[PDB]
Structures are given as structure tokens and as C-alpha cells.
């Protein structure tokens, strides 16, 4: 390695090092000192920032130094500790990506039952166990394989992992550790892309119809449970409970769980849409509408039934003609509007605007999606060349050159610099605490 080369690489990866340390350390201190940031969401980013911090302060610098000098000078035990720390931290980063992806998936697909158990305790337990499984997966074999085999194979002055002898070995580990997590993450991500609409429908109908896990008597008097699930119009409090037990599958005794309310809601809403597509009057307009207004009409069918909604003849035609304001005014003439005005006005605003403004704002959530997509894409592109190089090195011996190995190994470190720069700068509270910390002027 030439002197100019050494100076350039050392300076640049130095800068990248202190940028990683500064960023992730700022996440840690901001979380510690600002209670507004002490959210379960930020538990995960704190753990990620611990991994990226470890990588930023030890890994990039020891690896860049050993690569520039050409030999390892800190000894065998320091070598083993460095590789153990690097692989444990990196596998931890992957594991936290998986944990975030699953957390988001369950938050969208089980918006009621999962959100009820997203407690700081459970978050801390699963973060800690992600780190535990990373450590168990990498540290024992990196440090003690030499004593178990009986001799240390790695040359004096050099530093690498002994048990990754064969390229097929390291490619199997690359599948378990990288490829399968990446595929699971992507399949999730897409699944959330295809489920946000159903969650918005669920939350809309929970706002309008309410949620009770104990049976109550509705407007007309009949017995209902869950999110507006009517059991039976009979007057017998146990004629209701028998149909409840038949609907869930256990002796309900009148009380259900929130995931049973989610199951009951899914059966109800699927029945609503399936019926809509069976009804000759509602199918044309439902087909003509976008997703949000489709949700408004699903709302009306949930409240009044298909015959009752089909009774809105002229307003439904105005909906088919995209005459939103005239349809709003016309639906305001209805007894429906005069009997449940607060819900009817929300539904009407949904028809008029085609947005969720009458029910909820999704700005912060959409930006959180942008942040997560940025993080995972940075991960994929900075980590993919190395694992592709493993994949190739299994089929062919020594195709990929040593320079390429060095660069692809070094590139996996960069997403540790990128991760805090995603949520931190464009997310408020983080930005403001970063500012007041870098100013040394934080007094609560």
C-alpha cells in the first residue's frame, strides 16, 4: 500500500468514522435527555444506533488500519475480539431491521390487538434477545473454534475467521445471516404496501361504530359485540351469546378478545364488499370509485345495509358522475344525515375530498415509511456487493479479486453512517435535540 493511498483512505474513512460516531452518539444522548423521544418506536432506533455506533468507533478503524498497514499488530486475542465485535454488531443490525419490519407489519395487519401489547417491556425484551441471538450466533465460534480444533490456523500478523474455511461454508452462513433476512424484509415491506388500505378501513369503521368487547344493546335495541357486529335481533341475552360462541368458537360468556374483534370485523367487512359486488345497483359506483371513497361506501353499507344504501339513488349516481359537492349536499337531505349527523358528516367529507381528513392524518406515518425505506435500501445496496461476491466465489475459485473483497467488505460499514442521517435530520424533536446538544445548551 502506497503512502498517498494510505493517507487518502485513512482520512476519508476517518471522516466517515467520526460522522458515524457523532450521529449515532447524538441519537443515544438525545434519547437519554429528551423524554419526548422516549417512545417504543425509538427503542428500536436506539438499538440500531448502538450497533452502528460499535461499528463506527471500533470496526471501520481497526479494519481500515489493518488493511492499510497490511498486517495485524495488536495480537491474536485483539484480532478475535475485533472480529467477534464486528460480526455480532452487524448481525445485530440485521436482526433489528427484521424486528422493525415485523413490528410495522403487525402494527398494520393487527391494528387493534397488537397495538395493545406494544409495551416498553416487550420492546426491551425482544431488542435484548435480538442482541443475544446475534452474540450467540457469532462470538463463541469466532473466539473458541481454535481451542476446539486444537490449533490456530490464521497466520501470525493476519486476522480473519478460522471456521469460514470453505467458500461454500461462508455462503451457507451468508444465506442464513443475510439473504433470508433480506427476503423476509422485502416480502414484509410489500405486504404492508398492500394492507395499509384495509387498516385504514378498519380504523375508520372503529371510529364510526366504536369498540366494545362486552355485549351491548344498539340503537334499535338488538345485541351487538365488537366493532358493530350484530349477533341476533331476538330479545334473549343468551340467544345472543349462543350465536357469539358459534361465531368465535369457544364459550365466550359475553366477552371477547381484541383479536377476536378483529376476526369478527374481517368477516363483517368482507361480507359487506362481497355483497356490494353482488348487488347490481352498488357495484357500478363502487367499481368507479377510488380506494378512499370505496371505504366511505363500505362504511354506509356497514351502517345501513345494501338496500338502504341503494335507496340513495340520485346521490349514488352523482357519486358515479364524480359530482362530489352536489352528492355531499344531496346526502345532507337524508334522514340518515338527520339521525347520525356526526358520522354522516365524516362519511360525506370522505366522499367529497377523497381523503381521510375527516378521520385521521397520516403525514407522520408516511414520512416514517419514507425513512424506513431509505434505511433498508441503503442496507441492501451497501451490503449486497459483498454477499454477491460470496455467491460468485462459491461457483468459481478466485474470480473476484482481493481488491474487490477489500472494497466490498469496507462498503458494508457505510449504512451505519447513513442510518441516523435518515430519521434524525428530517424528523423533528431529534433535529432540535441534536441542535441544542451540539450547542451545549440543554437544560431540560
Amino acid at each position: 500500500k502506497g503512502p498517498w493511498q494510505v493517507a487518502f483512505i485513512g482520512i476519508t474513512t476517518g471522516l466517515l468514522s467520526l460522522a458515524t460516531v457523532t450521529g449515532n452518539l447524538l441519537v443515544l444522548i438525545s434519547f437519554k435527555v429528551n423524554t419526548e423521544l422516549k417512545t417504543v418506536n425509538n427503542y428500536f432506533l436506539l438499538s440500531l444506533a448502538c450497533a452502528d455506533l460499535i461499528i463506527g468507533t471500533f470496526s471501520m478503524n481497526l479494519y481500515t488500519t489493518y488493511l492499510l498497514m497490511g498486517h495485524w499488530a495488536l495480537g491474536t486475542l485483539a484480532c478475535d475480539l475485533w472480529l467477534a465485535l464486528d460480526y455480532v454488531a452487524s448481525q445485530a443490525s440485521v436482526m433489528n431491521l427484521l424486528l422493525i419490519s415485523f413490528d410495522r407489519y403487525f402494527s398494520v395487519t393487527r391494528p387493534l390487538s397488537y397495538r395493545a401489547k406494544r409495551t416498553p417491556r416487550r420492546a426491551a425484551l425482544m431488542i435484548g434477545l435480538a442482541w443475544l441471538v446475534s452474540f450467540v450466533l457469532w462470538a463463541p465460534a469466532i473466539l473458541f473454534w481454535q481451542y476446539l480444533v486444537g490449533e490456530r490456523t490464521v497466520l501470525a500478523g493476519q486476522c480473519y475467521i478460522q471456521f469460514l474455511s470453505q467458500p461454500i461454508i461462508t455462503f451457507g452462513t451468508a444465506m442464513a445471516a443475510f439473504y433470508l433476512p433480506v427476503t423476509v424484509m422485502c416480502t414484509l415491506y410489500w405486504r404492508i404496501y398492500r394492507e395499509t388500505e384495509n387498516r385504514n378501513i378498519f380504523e375508520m369503521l372503529r371510529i364510526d361504530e366504536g369498540l366494545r368487547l362486552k355485549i351491548y344493546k344498539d340503537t334499535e335495541g338488538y345485541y351487538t359485540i365488537g366493532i358493530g357486529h350484530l349477533l341476533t335481533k331476538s330479545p334473549s341475552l343468551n340467544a345472543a351469546k349462543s350465536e357469539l360462541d358459534k361465531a368465535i368458537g369457544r364459550n365466550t360468556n359475553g366477552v371477547i378478545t381484541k383479536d377476536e374483534a378483529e376476526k369478527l370485523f374481517n368477516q363483517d367487512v368482507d361480507a359487506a364488499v362481497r355483497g356490494i359486488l353482488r348487488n347490481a345497483k352498488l357495484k357500478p359506483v363502487y367499481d368507479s370509485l377510488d380506494a378512499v371513497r370505496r371505504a366511505a361506501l363500505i362504511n354506509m353499507v356497514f351502517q345501513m345495509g345494501e338496500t338502504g344504501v341503494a335507496g340513495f339513488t340520485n346521490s349514488l349516481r352523482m357519486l358515479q358522475q364524480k359530482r362530489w359537492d352536489e352528492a355531499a349536499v344531496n346526502l345532507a337531505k337524508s334522514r340518515w344525515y338527520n339521525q347520525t349527523p356526526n358520522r354522516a358528516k365524516r362519511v360525506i367529507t370522505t366522499f367529497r375530498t377523497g381523503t381521510w381528513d375527516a378521520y385521521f392524518s397520516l403525514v407522520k406515518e408516511k414520512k416514517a415509511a419514507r425513512t424506513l425505506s431509505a434505511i433498508l435500501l441503503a442496507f441492501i445496496l451497501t451490503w449486497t456487493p459483498y454477499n454477491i461476491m460470496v455467491l460468485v466465489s462459491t461457483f468459481c475459485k478466485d474470480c473476484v479479486p482481493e481488491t474487490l473483497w477489500e472494497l466490498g467488505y469496507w462498503l458494508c460499514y457505510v449504512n451505519s453512517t447513513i442510518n441516523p442521517m435518515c430519521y434524525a435530520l428530517c424528523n423533528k424533536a431529534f433535529r432540535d435535540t441534536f441542535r441544542l446538544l451540539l450547542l451545549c445548551r440543554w437544560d431540560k
Binding site: 418506536n41 380504523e203 385521521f360 397520516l362 407522520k364 406515518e365
Partner: peptide, 7 residues
Amino acid sequence: DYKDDDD
């Protein structure tokens, strides 16, 4: 889980 956060 953001969704409910204020702007």
C-alpha cells in the same frame, strides 16, 4: 406505529 402522531 406512528399513524396517530400529530403533524
